[PDB]
Amino acid sequence: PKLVLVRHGQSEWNEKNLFTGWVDVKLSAKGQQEAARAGELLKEKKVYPDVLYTSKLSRAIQTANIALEKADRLWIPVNRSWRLNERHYGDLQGKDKAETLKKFGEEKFNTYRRSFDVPPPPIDASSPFSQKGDERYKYVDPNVLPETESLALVIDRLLPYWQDVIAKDLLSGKTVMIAAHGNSLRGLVKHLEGISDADIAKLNIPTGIPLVFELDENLKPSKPSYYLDPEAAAA
Amino acid sequence: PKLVLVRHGQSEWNEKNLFTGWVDVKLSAKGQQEAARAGELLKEKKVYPDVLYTSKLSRAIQTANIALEKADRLWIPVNRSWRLNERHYGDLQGKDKAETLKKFGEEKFNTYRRSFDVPPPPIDASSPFSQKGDERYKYVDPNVLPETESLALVIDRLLPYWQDVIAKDLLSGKTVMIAAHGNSLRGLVKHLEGISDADIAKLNIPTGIPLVFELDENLKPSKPSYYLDPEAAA
Amino acid sequence: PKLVLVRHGQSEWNEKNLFTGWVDVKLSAKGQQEAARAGELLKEKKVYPDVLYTSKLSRAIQTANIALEKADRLWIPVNRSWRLNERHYGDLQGKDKAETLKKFGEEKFNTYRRSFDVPPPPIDASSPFSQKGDERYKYVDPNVLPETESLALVIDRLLPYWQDVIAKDLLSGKTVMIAAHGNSLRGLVKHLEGISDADIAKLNIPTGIPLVFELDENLKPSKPSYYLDPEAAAA
Amino acid sequence: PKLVLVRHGQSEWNEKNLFTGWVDVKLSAKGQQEAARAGELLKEKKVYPDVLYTSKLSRAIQTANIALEKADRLWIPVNRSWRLNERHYGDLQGKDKAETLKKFGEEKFNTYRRSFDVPPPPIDASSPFSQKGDERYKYVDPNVLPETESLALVIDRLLPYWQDVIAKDLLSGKTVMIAAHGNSLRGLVKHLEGISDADIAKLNIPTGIPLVFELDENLKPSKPSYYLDPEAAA
Ligand SMILES: O=P(O)(O)O[C@H]1[C@@H](OP(=O)(O)O)[C@@H](OP(=O)(O)O)[C@@H](OP(=O)(O)O)[C@@H](OP(=O)(O)O)[C@@H]1OP(=O)(O)O
Ligand SMILES: O=P(O)(O)O[C@H]1[C@@H](OP(=O)(O)O)[C@@H](OP(=O)(O)O)[C@@H](OP(=O)(O)O)[C@@H](OP(=O)(O)O)[C@@H]1OP(=O)(O)O
């Protein structure tokens, strides 16, 4: 089994320097370009996705749409799950980062961001940046939908989908492509490579560059992961 | 029940004067502008799709992705089927429309183009323009895939999908959207409105402008189909 | 690819000499033994279905349950379609088979029964033996559901499902098992073996005996089909 | 939203005094009569399941088939999942309950039987009573498949399936039926009503009697649950 992870490029809120989380934000004109290059890299490097897996957040869906259109594989099957979404930023969704830093000071700020298990305070259910009762999640248990998260909490809800659903295609000899987000992807990678809780903060997965994993019958790396553009990734 | 039909905008072969059919040709820069106009019409005119259905051809898949991006509904479930594909053009796929009109003459040219029962000649299986063995059809009974088609044949392979798959969603209370091709879409309209075998040749579906059908429980129009741009429709 | 066909044993109506059709009649007590017998036959000859398809008619669903029980493959995926159903017997549904011979006469009786393309008279909509409005067909285009059917009509409706859905498991290397009826199963064997409209009336598929086919990449037979009990099948 | 839970009855191992768990043991002649009574109970008390969910252990599947046969809804769509499976007993699987009590003693025996979070010793992978590699689970991440469990662990792996899959049908207005096991069914009950980690051991779900739940938008009980045979459940 071969798996391919693709992290989306920058969003319209990344540009405005706002915390995103689950807020459905569009890809910036810049991020739309990294997607094309991700697709160009798939075709070029001869990595051919048999099935596609995305989150319910537009930016990642778009990235897949663009990338698969340069790769000549727009036709492949597509499943979307909330469990592949980004780490919900809680109360911090739609709040200036630079302003957050001032109001919270450098320690607390860094915790909420590069901390493994400390979630931002939860967001108010009535806030303009609350996706509580959002149409795209109406067939899911309302009680499982988070109002704030941490990388650890992201991994918890991601695994069940991976184990059941994604594993199915991998174990069926299908090359799976996941177009996800920063937290959810490092989450998948922490699990796969057995990275401990402390060391995960050090992992960075760049944007618009496919990460490829070749797994054994037990879904454990047969060899070390590799990007289709090592140069661009090490920079 | 509610149904939205969207004919993909222009393609890369509209300027080449080549009969396309099943060849997986892409949208042009103009096709893409049209896709986004469809999406804007969906949002502007308040038509909110719950589920999406596309053919296995990139030009409609591209149109769907673009329109939905504009309508903020990029998240909805998406299913694809070859039974929504364009009318296969047999040996005519990849050939100059104007050169072909000089070889077969006007009458034969119109029959190959707008006849209900008469299909083009079977394409050679080794022709560089044959979709035989195409990976995107490798989990389909090989013996059913066409080598030429007519609107009659198209309608035949399209109905089973509409009958089981698409109707389940309409009878489940969903607003279904179909991003397809001109022939297959006219094929469906014929079925829905009971258009005669003689009268169907003259119907035309505007590219990039959504046709909405308000169906009853028997999947029959409860009122006449309306385009989201009625003035531009006709 | 390996396909396995299992024709269900007699119903309670077959017992009372009545034309069944789409009427949801239950398997008779002999039919239950014929079912069990069928399962004990899949296990013995080493035919292991990875997936199962059935009709919406309880008599065939029931045949699979019992057969798969004795076979130890109760866990496999199960999909069911009206397209795999028996031929809708029209007005003849719920009528004594012997009173129909007297009422119509030989040629016409042998017509509505063994003809390839001439279907029985359509059954009245308010008749008790009418499947119109039936809950198990409520998510299917109302307009496609028959009110009478011929063998020709049956293959036309059955073929789409076999081409799209069933063909997917075969082509995926999975061993398929289909629990259907007389007409639907023969209509499919006709398709497979190229039997002409003329020579089809002549073919009979014995009940409770698994007919296995060894197909190739084009879904066309490699070697001649064979029952698991050649003697009882030829009896 | 209406959910009906059904516990499967007597297995071939009730007379054997053996730890079952994930071994694929089948019903006994009585187990089958209890499944018929459940079916007759469904039909009689007018509760019509629109769709079915079951574990991957034969004893519950049989129950479901027999039950639906009597109820007349044999046709309904059926879904299966390892996440509805019984609690795994680990090394104890296939071992005599009495000989086990001699090896560990009362306290440690009750702990392995009635506690909420102290699971049994991990079953060796080369034990003939180990479900490792069984075909029914070949398309599941090998890593997540248990080598022993507790009710606490059952609830952790069961939940994801309920949340995404089962609740989908529930939130779609369908009447759902789960034919599972004692641990898995009680596991779901502890979650549905808010039963404490220590009060759950005091909950007993009767074999063969369908337990109905009338839920609300949040999948929390609107009114208290009710068996289709109140007197028999007590
Ligand atoms: O002129 P447009 O409205 O843009 O549509 C045309 C046209 O379709 P209609 O005539 O049905 O509207 C062509 O059909 P013919 O006139 O040649 O019959 C069709 O060419 P094909 O016959 O090859 O389909 C061609 O499509 P293409 O450019 O792919 O050849 C193109 O449609 P598009 O605007 O979608 O490209
Ligand atoms: O005593 P019963 O009502 O007949 O039910 C028992 C019982 O289950 P409950 O205690 O949950 O009712 C056993 O459990 P213990 O009392 O011994 O803890 C269980 O044995 P396991 O320990 O192996 O689960 C056994 O099942 P089996 O006969 O398969 O061993 C059986 O349940 P069934 O009546 O459903 O078989």
Q: Taking a C-beta distance cutoff of 8 angstroms, is the pair B12, B226 a contact?
A: no
By annotation, the residues of D acting in catalysis are 8, 86
From the list D177, B160, A192, A110, the residue with the least C-alpha distance to C83 is B160
- The closest-lying atom of ligand 1 relative to the alpha carbon of residue B183 is 11
SS3 assignment for chain D? CEEEEEECCCECCCCCCEECCCCCCCECHHHHHHHHHHHHHHHHCCCCCCEEEECCCHHHHHHHHHHHHHHCCCCCCEEECHHHCCCCCHHHECCEHHHHHHHHCHHHHHHHHHCCCCCCCCCCCCCCCCCCCCHHHCCCCCCCCCCCCCHHHHHHHHHHHHHHHHHHHHCCCCEEEEEECHHHHHHHHHHHHCCCCCCHHHCCCCCCCCEEEEECCCCCECCCCEECCCCCCC
Would you say the C-alpha torsion B71, B77, B83, B88 has a positive or negative sign? positive
Would you say the C-alpha torsion B195, B199, B200, B202 has a positive or negative sign? negative
Q: Taking a C-beta distance cutoff of 8 angstroms, is the pair B68, B74 a contact?
A: yes
Structure tokens given for C1: 């690819």
Calpha distance B163→B185 (Å, rounded)? 15
Gaps in chain C with C–N over 2.5 Å, residue before each: none
Distance from the first to the final alpha carbon of chain D: 26
| Nearest CB to D74; choose among C58, C69, C76 | C58
A38, C162, D201 from A3: Cα distances, Å = 15, 31, 43
- Counted residue by residue, chain D has a size of 234
Contacts of C196 (CB under 8 A, 6+ apart): none
Q: Taking a C-beta distance cutoff of 8 angstroms, is the pair D176, D51 a contact?
A: yes
Structure tokens given for D138: 């070949």
Calpha distance B89→A90 (Å, rounded)? 55
Contacts of C101 (CB under 8 A, 6+ apart): C109
| Nearest CB to D61; choose among C58, C61, C75 | C75
- Give the H or E element holding residue B106: helix B97-114
From the list D201, D41, D185, the residue with the least C-alpha distance to D116 is D201
Residue with tokens 């033996």: C129
Side chain identity at residue B177, one-letter code:
M
Q: Give me the CATH number covering residue A46.
A: 3.40.50.1240
Q: Edge-to-edge strand order for the sheet containing D226-227?
A: D78-80, D51-54, D175-180, D2-7, D211-214, D226-227
Binding partners of D (≥3 Cβ pairs within 8 A):
A, C
Q: Taking a C-beta distance cutoff of 8 angstroms, is the pair A215, A2 a contact?
A: yes
Neighbour count for residue C151 (Cβ, 10 Å): 23
Catalytic-labelled residue, pool C34, C86, C147, C149: C86
Q: Give the strand pairing for C51-54 and C78-80.
A: parallel
| Nearest CB to C144; choose among B142, B157, B163 | B163
SS3 for A69?
A: helix
Q: What are phi and psi of A147, to 5 degrees?
A: -110, 5
Q: Taking a C-beta distance cutoff of 8 angstroms, is the pair A5, A217 a contact?
A: no
Q: Is C107 a catalytic residue?
A: no
Count CA atoms closer than 13 A to D54's CA, side-chain side: 25
From the number of C-beta atoms within 10 Å of its C-beta (0-12, 13-18, 19+), residue B173 rates as exposed
Neighbour count for residue B126 (Cβ, 10 Å): 7
Calpha distance C138→B172 (Å, rounded)? 9
What does DSSP assign to residue A81?
A: -
- Chain A positions with Cβ closer than 8 Å to B: 24, 26, 56-58, 61-62, 65, 69, 72, 74-75, 77-78, 80, 136
From the list D222, D201, D233, D216, the residue with the least C-alpha distance to D5 is D233
Neighbour count for residue D216 (Cβ, 10 Å): 10
Question: Is A80 annotated for ligand binding?
Answer: no
Contact flag C218-B142 (C-beta cutoff 8 Å): yes
Catalytic-labelled residue, pool A86, A147, A149, A181: A86
Ligand 1 contact via B10 beta carbon (within 6 Å): yes
Using an 8 Å CB-CB cutoff, list chain A residues near B74: 58, 61-62, 65
Structure obtained using: X-ray
Give the gap in angstroms from C-alpha C195 to the nearest C-alpha of chain D.
Answer: 32
SS3 for C182?
A: helix
Using an 8 Å CB-CB cutoff, list chain D residues near C72: 58
Domain extent, residue C190, equals: 1-235
Contacts of B19 (CB under 8 A, 6+ apart): B89, B92, B93, B94, B95, B97, B100
Calpha distance D98→D114 (Å, rounded)? 16
From the list A229, A233, A220, A227, the residue with the least C-alpha distance to A5 is A227
Calpha distance D81→A169 (Å, rounded)? 16
Q: Choose the residue to mutate in D15, D20, D154, D186 for probing ligand 2, maximizing ligand atoms within 8 Å of C-beta.
A: D20
Neighbour count for residue D129 (Cβ, 10 Å): 19
Structure tokens given for A21: 């989380």
Q: Taking a C-beta distance cutoff of 8 angstroms, is the pair D2, D46 a contact?
A: no
Count CA atoms closer than 13 A to B233's CA, side-chain side: 14
- The closest-lying atom of ligand 2 relative to the alpha carbon of residue D14 is 28
- Give the H or E element holding residue A113: helix A97-114
What does DSSP assign to residue B31?
A: H
Number of structural domains in chain C: 1
Contact flag D62-C77 (C-beta cutoff 8 Å): no
